[PDB]
Amino acid sequence: RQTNQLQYLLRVVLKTLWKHQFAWPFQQPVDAVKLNLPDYYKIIKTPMDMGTIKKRLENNYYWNAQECIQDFNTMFTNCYIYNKPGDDIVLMAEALEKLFLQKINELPT
Ligand SMILES: Cc1cc(F)cc(C)c1Oc1ccc(C(C)(C)O)cc1-c1cn(C)c(=O)c2cc(-c3cnc(C4CCCC4)[nH]3)oc12
């Protein structure tokens, strides 16, 4: 249930992604009412965002680092599922994904 890693995810991975210029549409859940997307919550069975991941790291939700990494990935794949390729939100998620994977490669064991 590695804690060096969970701590790394919070202070380094999440911190870096959260500062990114493209982070803002992923810092909270997709408000399907505001954005007028009635199908979103039927299509996306496991919504995810960095708001929720942050809360989970700050409140001892995660069993281990892999469970948290799945959530980061779910956020990205949720975005690629729902939206057409080429859409701006997809380019944004793609940039965030490069960076996420970079930072994951320097993870302590
Ligand atoms: C990044 C971006 C740029 C824009 F010019 C317009 C939007 C809506 C936009 O996305 C969002 C803006 C605000 C919010 C808030 C903060 C209110 O929850 C969310 C999004 C947004 C985030 N994520 C992860 C998404 O997957 C989608 C998807 C959409 C979206 C809204 N309308 C669409 C489609 C369906 C109608 C034709 C375009 N997709 O908006 C978001």
- Atom 17 of ligand 1, nearest CA residue: 31
Assess whether the C-beta atom of 30 lies below 6 angstroms from ligand 1.
Answer: yes
Angstrom CA distances, 72 to 6, 63, 86, stand at 13, 15, 21
Yes or no: say if 69 and 104 are a contact pair by the CB < 8 Å rule. Answer: yes
Yes or no: say if 22 and 87 are a contact pair by the CB < 8 Å rule. Answer: no
Distance between Cα 89 and ligand 1 center (Å): 7
Residue of 22, 30, 87, 96 with the most ligand 1 atoms within 8 Å of its CB, for mutation: 30
What does this entry list as its resolution, in Å? 2.8
Class of the 3-107 domain? mainly alpha
Yes or no: say if 50 and 88 are a contact pair by the CB < 8 Å rule. Answer: no
Deposited experimental method: X-ray
